[PDB]
Paper text:
pmcThe specific interaction of proteins with the nucleosome is central to the regulation of chromatin function and dynamics. The tardigrade damage suppressor (Dsup) and vertebrate high-mobility group N (HMGN) proteins bind specifically to nucleosomes via a conserved motif whose structure has not been experimentally determined. Here we used cryo-EM to show that both proteins bind to the nucleosome acidic patch via analogous arginine anchors with one molecule bound to each face of the nucleosome. In addition, to study nucleosome structure in the context of active chromatin, we analyzed nucleosomes that were reconstituted with a promoter-containing DNA sequence from a Xenopus borealis somatic 5S rDNA gene.
We first obtained three structures from a non-cross-linked sample of the 167 bp 5S rDNA nucleosome, which contains a 10 bp linker DNA on each end. The three 167 bp 5S rDNA nucleosome structures, which we refer to as closed, open I, and open II, lack density for the linker DNAs and differ in the interactions involving the core nucleosomal DNA. The closed 167 bp 5S rDNA nucleosome shows density for the entire 147 bp core DNA, which is wrapped around the histone octamer, and the open I and open II conformations show additional flexibility in one or both DNA ends, respectively. Specifically, R77 of H2A near the DNA end upstream of the TSS inserts into the minor groove at SHL −5.5, contributing to the stabilization of the DNA around the histone octamer in the closed, open I, and open II conformations. PCA revealed that the main source of variability corresponds to the attachment/detachment of the downstream 5S rDNA end to/from the histone octamer. The transition between the closed conformation and the unwrapping of the downstream DNA end is indicated by the fading of the density between SHL +5 and SHL +7 and the increased mobility of H3αN and H2A residues 107–116 in some frames.
Author numbering:
A (entry chain H): 29 to 121
B (entry chain A), E (entry chain E): 37 to 135
C (entry chain G): 11 to 118
D (entry chain B), F (entry chain F): 21 to 102
G (entry chain C): 11 to 119
H (entry chain D): 29 to 123
Write the structure that this text describes.
DNA sequence: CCGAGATCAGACGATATCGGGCACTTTCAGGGTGGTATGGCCGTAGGCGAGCACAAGGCTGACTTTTCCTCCCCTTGTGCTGCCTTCTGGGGGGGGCCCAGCTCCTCCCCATGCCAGGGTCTTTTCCCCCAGGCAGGAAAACAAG
DNA sequence: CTTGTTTTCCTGCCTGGGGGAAAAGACCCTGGCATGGGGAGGAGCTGGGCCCCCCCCAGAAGGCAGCACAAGGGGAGGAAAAGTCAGCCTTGTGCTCGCCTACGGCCATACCACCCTGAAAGTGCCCGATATCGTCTGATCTCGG
């Protein structure tokens, strides 16, 4: 007997925060977990390539920010960078 | 004499009906029988998950629709509405699948 | 933050900072992973989550439906110009296509 | 399934696929041309997936093998795991 | 009257000349100025390694040469010899730059 | 080098690029379209090269930055390193 | 074959098995790298290099040149069908393009 | 003081060149291109093998993963010959 | 502009199936402590990137002729669409079976980590040969009688 | 079909500049030894993929009428192309400066590793309540007269 992990306990908590009236189907939850798994790999791979290019051995926040800037379109990158910076600033202090 | 639809109207109605739908437009068994035929030349006595054959179907059906969405533009560029094999060949070559 | 609680609550997110950190550490991306990288990633992912869920809920409400299906996600992604650029080579299963007819193929 | 199931993709099915792409009129050779195009693409996918299947020392082709084969070709697929 | 060539033979002569060669067809300085003007919108007081500008020129010329091959095919498909902006738009849309 | 440098890729240069591409005849509106296309492509590549330069905490855009930016968009360039 | 020498000469390769192993180790690909993975890669890369350096040598001999220039490699790559597939999205600096004219754009009778 | 040293495949590319074509040289730009080609296909195969070993939850990259990555990345005859030469190299290194 | 006829749209009864919530657990995240090693900071140097005269000459910008290519209109017949009828086979339910994929326990051969040592790879000189340039000659397409 | 007219290839001579070999060094690969740990292998369980059977009715296949669109042909004009002629701005050379990137040395604090506990979430169970089907009209679109 084994258990699996997914972003289903967390997508359904953002869905009930942004639209607290609509639900979601199992197939939609699977698609929306595949989306998170794809974007995570994209950003992580780009940050890894950046760190390897700059001869660094540590993936900091300034590598994730650069990966986000490279990977997302204009407004998406502008809002994602600000959200990440706010989260980091509140987490640190 | 009975009532008849002029050509083109039924085609547009079918376009509107199939663009608002989501269902699979290829019968499942004839596609599974083709997948289990293509896989034999690569490896024999292969088993196939129903999820795997469904993934193959919903990938091929989005490939073919996306290809016809370019063949239509290739037909319109030639001042046509019928889509011909030359249009498909041009679309594929420009995409890069034929070079 | 001075309060000693979970790292997602400490950052104000709804995504798992701990498991994002574990995935960054065990995915072999670099020899070392900083402490703020999971926080940044679990805030970019949670924003990209709410950017698609909001539009999919809008699409669901536009069709008198109280549940989000793959069709609603596809409609949102393909109708939003930025999300269609991000997921431009992504096939949403059971999503269909946008309703679109060329103006030359309509009766005159 | 051994011989000649490429004709299992009936002409009405190809017409429906064309209609979903906005096509109003279809010639009489699009069907054969599309069957060829369909086979060429399926041959690539059900080869890149069987490669994973024999790398895992398995005889069943799981949905993850197909998903990875599609992802490696640039055609990422959402909904079937991953 | 003096000797004059028929329209369309110097075009093929130029095609063969510029296909047999490997030189760069855009003059270096006007492209360098273009690159420097473009990069200022992103960040001011930007220095360029000469190899970086040369790499940008080679990539841009390769891009344009490859795009004109897709444009000529569209122009031949439309039963034409002359390429027009609609051909470039169709080629870019199909290859995936305009969607 | 501040204003109106796109009119440096002159009509003869665009004609030579098309001649190398196999184009036998050119319409007179092709040049103002090829200029927009080149500007868009360069604005896409330099936007990533400058991002790499800023991340490296540098003030000079390097051939490695350009090569990595080109590689990112599936336009790998051989010759300048990497 | 059993020897106490360089691992490249132990396997019969002209490519550095040690360097390939080090690049795999410090490349963040996997925690562990087996003993036969650098030997396999140092032979795949050597075979591909030999293929291209033979086709480009043939192209250079077809142009009466003793030296290999980027144009020769471009000609070899774009004239080999199975190499053009491997390098379909690759630009060769100062490589030029394959000479070709469409049948429509030619003089008639 | 000293300048940091750089590394490249320009010692082995030339060795293979003098084996397949004894009398022809190679220019500096061509050697630079052949240096990026080897790095490119090294990175491609290494990344494919890494993802391959991650899919089956393996921590070791092996000749099996390299062979499967070669079979997944190269066209038909290229993959056939590369796999055969790699198998021969591994067999000779072990025997 | 006029009237039929087909087709889509809205709405209410209802029925099942699937989303959503509650409890057990079990397994992974978090707190505390140690240790070290990577990255930040200061200082130095010089390499290379930027800026400026100065040709000259090759390249670009503009005007003329005109030819031929694009564009439009006409007409035909052919191939495509639309509807009807037949019949087949895909979809669905129900059952049986055996193989293959997942899990667990042993341990053992393989990969890793660290030190000593040299042999292979890197950088600087240099020179001689191959490639570039150029002038004169022959050949080869090209177009107008 | 010829002759005249440009453009291109060929060949010999001159030259220069860059590639291949040699020399010194330094740095990383290899050999040796000790150690943990992942995976190879042998069982076991059981989930699911395969095979079979029976039924139906929904959809594909063939055909017929007929019509509208692809395609060939003719005419018109306008707009690129080819060829001169004038100027300009690119490029190559040379000279100057200083700014920025890379290297070296030092250290401090941030991240890995390890030890435990608890709480988050993963799974299973259950219930209700929304999406769909079905029938009935109502509105709208299409096409002949």
């Amino acid at each position: 007997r084994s258990r699996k992990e997914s972003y289903s306990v967390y997508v359904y908590k953002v869905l009930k925060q942004v639209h607290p009236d609509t639900g979601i189907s199992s197939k939609a939850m699977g698609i929306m977990n595949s989306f998170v798994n794809d974007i995570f790999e994209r950003i992580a791979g780009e940050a890894s390539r950046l760190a390897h290019y700059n001869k660094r051995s540590t993936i900091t926040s300034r590598e994730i920010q650069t990966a986000v800037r490279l990977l997302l379109p204009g407004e998406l990158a502008k809002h994602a960078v600000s959200e990440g910076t706010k989260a980091v600033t509140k987490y640190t202090s | 004499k009975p009532h008849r639809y002029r050509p083109g109207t039924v085609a547009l109605r079918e376009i509107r009906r199939y663009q608002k739908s989501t269902e699979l437009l290829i019968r499942k068994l004839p596609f599974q029988r083709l997948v289990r035929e293509i896989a034999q030349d690569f490896k024999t006595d292969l088993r196939f998950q129903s999820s795997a054959v469904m993934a193959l179907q919903e990938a091929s059906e989005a490939y073919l629709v996306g290809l016809f969405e370019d063949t239509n533009l290739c037909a319109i560029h030639a001042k046509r509405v019928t889509i011909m094999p030359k249009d498909i060949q041009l679309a594929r070559r420009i995409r890069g699948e034929r070079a | 933050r001075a309060k000693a609680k979970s790292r997602s609550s400490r950052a104000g997110l709804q995504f798992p900072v701990g498991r994002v950190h574990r995935l960054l550490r065990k995915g072999n991306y670099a020899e070392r992973v900083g402490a703020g990288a999971p926080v940044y990633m679990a805030a970019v992912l949670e924003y990209l989550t709410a950017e698609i869920l909001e539009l999919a809920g809008n699409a669901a409400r536009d069709n008198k439906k109280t549940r989000i299906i793959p069709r609603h996600l596809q409609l949102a992604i393909r109708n939003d110009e930025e999300l269609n650029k991000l997921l431009g080579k992504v096939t949403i299963a059971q999503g269909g296509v946008l309703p679109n007819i060329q103006a030359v193929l309509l009766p005159k | 399934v051994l011989r000649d199931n490429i004709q299992g993709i009936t002409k009405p099915a190809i017409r429906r696929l064309a209609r979903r792409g906005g096509v109003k009129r279809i010639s009489g050779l699009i069907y054969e041309e599309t069957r060829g195009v369909l086979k060429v693409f399926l041959e690539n996918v059900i080869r890149d997936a069987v490669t994973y299947t024999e790398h895992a020392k398995r005889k069943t082709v799981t949905a993850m093998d197909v998903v990875y084969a599609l992802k490696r070709q640039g055609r990422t697929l959402y909904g079937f795991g991953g």
